[PDB]
Every structure is written in structure tokens, then in C-alpha cells.
Design a protein around this ligand. Structure first.
Ligand SMILES: O=c1ccn([C@@H]2O[C@H](COP(=O)(O)OP(=O)(O)O[C@H]3O[C@H](CO)[C@H](O)[C@H](O)[C@H]3O)[C@@H](O)[C@H]2O)c(=O)[nH]1
Ligand SMILES: O=c1ccn([C@@H]2O[C@H](COP(=O)(O)OP(=O)(O)O[C@H]3O[C@H](CO)[C@H](O)[C@H](O)[C@H]3O)[C@@H](O)[C@H]2O)c(=O)[nH]1
Ligand SMILES: CCCCCCCCO[C@@H]1O[C@H](CO)[C@H](O)C[C@H]1O[C@@H]1O[C@@H](C)[C@@H](O)[C@@H](O)[C@@H]1O
Ligand SMILES: CCCCCCCCO[C@@H]1O[C@H](CO)[C@H](O)C[C@H]1O[C@@H]1O[C@@H](C)[C@@H](O)[C@@H](O)[C@@H]1O
Ligand SMILES: [Mn+2]
Ligand SMILES: [Mn+2]
Lengths: 279, 279
């Protein structure tokens, strides 16, 4: 049950004035594509705070990648779901290397130790922490650690299932996408199929939908392993196959996954929100 | 649980090419606004057929308005949710005046007799047929009878909660909207509030959300009656108040509720789908 929004004063949306004319803001299956200028964050914040929404954020920091945690977490505190309930889940082989980061109120961090590559992330999210995530959070957001937040990443992303447009491929035609192209792989996508190329570094949704996605990808990766094949881009190849066959209910624009050193700051990006750190 | 979509061949959506540049296609709360060119109906049909979706359509035909049923139903057979399961619910004071209309396979019609204005529709949808609708259909669509279908009205509209832009007000600023303006009415909306002016003639959603809306509107109308006030546009005024405080998850463009005699055929409408019949 959703209680009423309070009175709010904000600019009237105008039917004959688009928010953005330079980009696609809705997919052909009627999922919003999230760009700056498409959302009023005050309305969304109200809607999600009225539901007392809790967001879980999973991040893996294994071997040398523990070095990225301090900047990742400190910038998440500045920019990620501020004002909402957040539970960070840090999967690591080195619990003692997790930096002590000061958190805002209503935010918590759990260190989840894993044993000392390819299948780990999907397997861990789907086999290991199922009951815990279902009890503790409403949405799960699953991101790479070799990253920093530079600008707002908030409840505009939340939806039953989302993926994020890969920053190197958003202008590419589907035949150029680096999908798995061998029919012997479960991740196979023919050259005449595909909506978008989603990056493995930022996906999410409701706990149920994320567990479905990660379970399916893990099972598909296990089939490939049994058949002696490894998809060209590993879990990203499987993620792409899953999201082709199970359409996401929002798609995040490359504002949400960018590499400025590689790709600069194109006119189409009004904000760079979550960006690669050099490695 | 949603099974996988099959392989499909269709045009690739292109991120740097909008579907429509002349209209707003997403609200500031990230609800799609449904216009021609924004959706691939083949993808949507697959998604909804895989769930074996059943759509209930409620229509009231009381007193002289029984005359509109033949054209309403015959054109609904041509254009409304064709290929999907449909259950028509015809509320009337004259069961014997309901025309015998031949239905396509997977479609059924029930005549629901009511006693021989203002509060009837919201009351009937919310108090009377609650358990029945919950058992029989997945979505409810609630429309005026003084109408005909001229073009496709399909699963692109389906969502937890939708309203439809009134054809006379889609270009209007909010101060011009004919919302109830007296603070003594439960339907009151001040001049600095409002997203859109929705028409009472086409709303819907999941059965649960439609029952919530109609219950709230009925209760609000009963409060007004007890206080000796009747909102300026009756149930439409209350519908507008509800949808201001409970944002719809899709908004239908005026393609879905048009009067060609009154308003012609503007460039912004590529299709006229559901249109007023003279009276
Ligand atoms: O030694 C490692 C390697 C990786 N990671 C974790 O795995 C994430 C992904 O690895 P990278 O950041 O090194 O890789 P990319 O940003 O290039 O990710 C892409 O390339 C990967 C292969 O290197 C996979 O194919 C993945 O699906 C694809 O999105 C990291 O952020 C980190 O969270 C570790 O913790 N330790
Ligand atoms: O004698 C009647 C009158 C109305 N109706 C039913 O009520 C629907 C709505 O009535 P109208 O079509 O006459 O009215 P509008 O199309 O002008 O509807 C608008 O005006 C109404 C007042 O006339 C209400 O305010 C309503 O909320 C608003 O959308 C009809 O389609 C019909 O389904 C009947 O069955 N019999
Ligand atoms: C020099 C690196 C050029 C990489 C360009 C394409 O990005 C790569 O795309 C792959 C799928 O085709 C896969 O997702 C890895 C991805 O490379 C990662 O993401 C880029 C945006 C860079 O940050 C790169 O350093 C990183 O490895
Ligand atoms: C001559 C009639 C002019 C009516 C223009 C405005 O439409 C009316 O708007 C009202 C709210 O301000 C309310 O919704 C009734 C609505 O009139 C109905 O819808 C129109 C589009 C016409 O079809 C009209 O005949 C019908 O009564
Ligand atoms: Mn990375
Ligand atoms: Mn009418």
C-alpha cells in the first residue's frame, strides 16, 4: 500500500515540450532510459521515502582490488542514495584490508568474506546470500569497485530490473556489439538480435529479480564450463543474453557508467555520475 | 515468474535517435506517456501473452446510453486487445437492451444489472464486484460507452495504474485546468499544483490498483456529499485528485481519448484510436 504524496510545488510537465530531444528516453518495450532532465528527483525521493526503501549495494574487492574501496565508499557516501536507507555488502578475501569509512545515518556496511574469477560474482549474489538480501533490502544494486561516484546516483534507477548502457557502445549498431557469437555458448546472440550492449559493471533491481538474473547467469556459465567454452566477456556476455530475453524495466544511460580518460565528456552527457578509476 | 522471450527480429533501438521529438514521452516520475512510435507492439504482445494476461473492460450503459453499446462492442472486437483474453463487464439497468455482439475466441461478456448518476461508477467498480474482478482478470480498463474504437488499443496501455490525457487540455497550463478549486471539496487542487488533466472516460491498471483508486474516489465523493458540495466535474475531479497524489505508472496520450468533431486531427496525433460518438 502506497500512501498519498504531500502537496508539492514544482514545474508543470508540458506535453508538447520534450525533456530531451537529443536522445531516446524510452525503450520500445516502454522502459524509461534514465538521463538527466527526464526525472524530478523531488517527486521520486518522496515516492521512495514514503515506502521506507532500503537499497543494498554489492561490491567485490578481491586481491589487489581492495585498494579501490576507500574512494569507492567515500564517494558513495557523497552521492549514492543520500537520504535513503543503504546497506553496503563488501565481498572480499581480505576483511582486514577494508578501509574504515565513516557512514551517514541510516547506512551500514557488512564485510562478507569469500575464498581466495569468472563465475564468482553471479554465483555469490545468487547462491550465497539469498535469504539475507530478501530479509534486509528492497533493491539490490551490483557494481564494480574500480569506480568512483562524482554526481547523484539515486532512486531514479530503482525498478524491478535494470541494466546500464556500456559507455563504449551506446552509439554502435548491434552487429558491432561484442556479444558472444559462438552458437555453442549459452550466451550466444546472433548478429540480427540485440537491443543494447549492457555493461557488467552496474545492474540491479528488486531482490527477487536480481536473484533471478544472477541465478540464470550462473547456471548458464556452468553449462558453458561443462561444454568447454568461456564466453568472450564472461559474466557480461551472459548478462547481455539475459537482458535480451528478459527486458529490463529501466535502462540507465552512460551517465551512470563512464570512463572520462577513455571517452571524454560528450555533449549528450549532462552529468558524469559514476566513473572509471585508472588501473 | 516470467519465462524467456523467444528470438525476435526487429529494428534496433538507437540511443541517439528519439522515437518522437515533438512530444513528451516520459513523465517526471519516469512513467511512459504512450504515443504511436514509442512502442514495438510485437515485443509487448509477446511479454503479455507469455503471462496469459486477461483484461477486464468495464462499461456503463444506463438509461438512453444503451444505444451506444452496439458500436462500442463491435469496434472493441476489431481493435481492443485482439489476441489477448478479454472479459467485458457491461453495467446496465436494461439487460434486455444489450445487443447480441459476436465475439472473437477467448473473449467473453457479462451483463451486470444495476438499479435505475454521480457516484455510481466508482462505487460499482470498488464496492460491488471486488472478489469477482480479482478472481477473473489481471487488469481492469474502465471506459465511457459514448465512444468507438477506430485503431489499435492494446497491451501497451497495461501497467499498475494509468490515466489518459484529456483531449481538450493536453496543451493547457495547469492554472487553466478545470480541477475542483474550492478548498471545501476533497477534490480540491490549488492553482500551483497539477501534472496533467486526466479525463474520467479512460483509466485503468491492475485490479488491485483500480480497486484502490475507485474506493478512494468513492469515499472522497461521500465526504463531499455529507458536506453539501459536489465537485465541478464529479468523478473526474476526484480522479484528478487521486492521480495527482498517486502518480500513474503510464499515461495515455490523447490518441486514446479523442473527439474528432470537436478537435479535428492535429499533427501530433498519428493515430486516432478511441473516439467520441456524437450525442
Ligand atoms: O582481481 C580482481 C578482478 C576483478 N574484481 C572485481 O570484478 C570487477 C570487474 O573486473 P574489472 O573491473 O577488472 O573488469 P572490467 O571493468 O573491464 O569488466 C569487464 O571485463 C571483465 C573481464 O576482465 C568481465 O568480462 C566483466 O563481465 C566485464 O564487464 C571489479 O570491479 C572488481 O569488483 C576483483 O575484485 N578482483
Ligand atoms: O445517462 C447516462 C449518463 C452517463 N452514463 C455513463 O457515464 C459515462 C460518462 O458520461 P458522459 O459520456 O455523458 O460524460 P462525458 O463524456 O462528458 O464525461 C465527463 O462529464 C461527466 C458529467 O456529465 C462527468 O463529470 C465525468 O466525470 C466526465 O469525464 C457515459 O459514457 C456512460 O458510460 C450512462 O450510462 N448513462
Ligand atoms: C584501453 C581499453 C579500451 C576498452 C574499450 C571497450 O571497453 C571494454 O568493453 C569490453 C566489451 O567489449 C568490456 O566491457 C571491457 C571494457 O573495458 C573496461 O571498460 C572501459 C570503459 C574502460 O574503463 C576499460 O579500461 C575497462 O577495462
Ligand atoms: C461542446 C462541448 C465542449 C467541451 C470541451 C471540454 O470537454 C469537456 O471537458 C470537461 C472538463 O472541463 C469534461 O471532461 C467534459 C468534456 O466534454 C466531453 O468531452 C469532450 C471531448 C466532448 O466529446 C464533449 O462533447 C463531451 O461532453
Ligand atoms: Mn571495472
Ligand atoms: Mn463520454
Amino acid at each position: 500500500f502506497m500512501v498519498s504524496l504531500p502537496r508539492m510545488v514544482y514545474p508543470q510537465p508540458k506535453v508538447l515540450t520534450p525533456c530531451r530531444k537529443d536522445v531516446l528516453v524510452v525503450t520500445p518495450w516502454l522502459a524509461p532510459i534514465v538521463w538527466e532532465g527526464t526525472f524530478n528527483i523531488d517527486i521520486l525521493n518522496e515516492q521512495f521515502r514514503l515506502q521506507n526503501t532500503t537499497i543494498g549495494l554489492t561490491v567485490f574487492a578481491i586481491k589487489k582490488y581492495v585498494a579501490f574501496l576507500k574512494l569507492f565508499l567515500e564517494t558513495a557516501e557523497k552521492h549514492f542514495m543520500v537520504g535513503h536507507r543503504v546497506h553496503y555488502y563488501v565481498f572480499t578475501d581480505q576483511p582486514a584490508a577494508v578501509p574504515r569509512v565513516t557512514l551517514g545515518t541510516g547506512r551500514q556496511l557488512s564485510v562478507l568474506e569469500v575464498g581466495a574469477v569468472s563465475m564468482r560474482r553471479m554465483e555469490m549474489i545468487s547462491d550465497f546470500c539469498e535469504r539475507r538480501f530478501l530479509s534486509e533490502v528492497d533493491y539490490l544494486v551490483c557494481v564494480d569497485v574500480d569506480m568512483e561516484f562524482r554526481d547523484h546516483v539515486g532512486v531514479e534507477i530503482l525498478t524491478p530490473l535494470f541494466g546500464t548502457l556500456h559507455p563504449s557502445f551506446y552509439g554502435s549498431s548491434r552487429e558491432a556489439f561484442t556479444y558472444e557469437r559462438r552458437p555453442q555458448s549459452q550466451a550466444y546472440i546472433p548478429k540480427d538480435e540485440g537491443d543494447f550492449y549492457y555493461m557488467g559493471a552496474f545492474f540491479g533491481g528488486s531482490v527477487q529479480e536480481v536473484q533471478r538474473l544472477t541465478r540464470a547467469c550462473h547456471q548458464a556459465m556452468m553449462v558453458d564450463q561443462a561444454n568447454g567454452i568461456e564466453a568472450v566477456w564472461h559474466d557480461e556476455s551472459h548478462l547481455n543474453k539475459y537482458l535480451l530475453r528478459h527486458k529490463p524495466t529501466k535502462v540507465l544511460s552512460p551517465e551512470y557508467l563512464w570512463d572520462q580518460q577513455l571517452l571524454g565528456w560528450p555533449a549528450v552527457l549532462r552529468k558524469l555520475r559514476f566513473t572509471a578509476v585508472p588501473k
